[PDB]
Structure 1
Amino acid sequence: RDGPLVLIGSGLSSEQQKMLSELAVILKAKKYTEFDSTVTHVVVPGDAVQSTLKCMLGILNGCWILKFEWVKACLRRKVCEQEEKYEIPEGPRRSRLNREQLLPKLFDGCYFYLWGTFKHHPKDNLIKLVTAGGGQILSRKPKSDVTQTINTVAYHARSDQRFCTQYIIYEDLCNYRVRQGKVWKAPSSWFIDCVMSFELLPL
Structure 2
Amino acid sequence: RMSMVVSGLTPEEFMLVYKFARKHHITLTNLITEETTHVVMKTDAEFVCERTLKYFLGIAGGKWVVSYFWVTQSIKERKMLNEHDFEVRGDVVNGRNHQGPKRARESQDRKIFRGLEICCYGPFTNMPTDQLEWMVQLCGASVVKELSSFTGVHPIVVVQPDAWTEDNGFHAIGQMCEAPVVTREWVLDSVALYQCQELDTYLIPQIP
Q: TM-score, normalised by structure 1?
A: 0.78
Kindly indicate whether residue 185 of structure 2 is the aligned counterpart of residue 189 of structure 1: yes
Aligned length: 178
> Which amino acid counterpart does residue 118 of structure 1 have in structure 2?
F
CA distances 1:93-143 after superposition (whole Å, capped 9, x unpaired) = 1111114xxx1333222111111111143322322222222211112215x
Select the residue among 99, 112, 117 that pairs with 1:111. Answer: 117
Partner-residue secondary structure (3-state), 2:13: helix
- Residues 29-71 of structure 1, C-alpha deviation per residue, up to 9 Å, x if partnerless? 1111100112111111113333222111111111111221110
Partner in structure 2 of residue 49 of structure 1: 49
CA distance in 2, matches of 1:192, 1:133: 12
Kept after mapping to 2: 8 A contact 1:105/1:133 = yes
Contact 1:7 1:31 in 2 (8 A): yes
Cα distance change on mapping 1:92 and 1:182 into 2, 3 Å: farther
Q: Residues 17-166 of structure 1 correspond to what in structure 2 (within 5 A)?
A: 17-46=14-43, 47-89=47-89, 90-99=99-108, 103-141=109-147, 150-152=151-153, 165-166=154-155
Return the alpha-carbon distance in structure 2 between the equivalents of residues 36 and 106 of structure 1.
Answer: 21
CA distance in structure 2 between the aligned counterparts of 1:21 and 1:78, rounded to whole angstroms: 16
What is the alpha-carbon root mean square deviation over aligned residues?
Answer: 2.3
* Percent identity of paired positions between Structure 1 and Structure 2: 22
Determine the C-alpha separation between the residues in 1 that align with 2:60 and 2:78.
Answer: 29
**Contact 2:136–2:187 (8 Å) recurs in 1:** no
* 2:147 alignment partner, SS class: coil
Letter in 1 for 2:157: I
TM-score of the aligned structures, taking structure 2 as reference length: 0.76
Q: 5+ residue gaps in structure 1?
A: 153-164
- After TM superposition, give the deviation of residue 182 of structure 1 in Å: 7.5
Partner residue, 1:159: none
Long gaps (5+) in structure 2: 90-98, 162-166, 200-208
Q: What displacement does 1:10 show?
A: 0.7
2:100 and 2:194 in contact (8 A); partners too: yes
- Shift, 1:192, TM fit: 0.9
Give the counterpart letter for 2:15 in structure 1. K
User: Residue 198 in 1 paired to residue 194 in 2?
Assistant: yes
Partners of 1:44 and 1:17 in 2: how far apart?
11
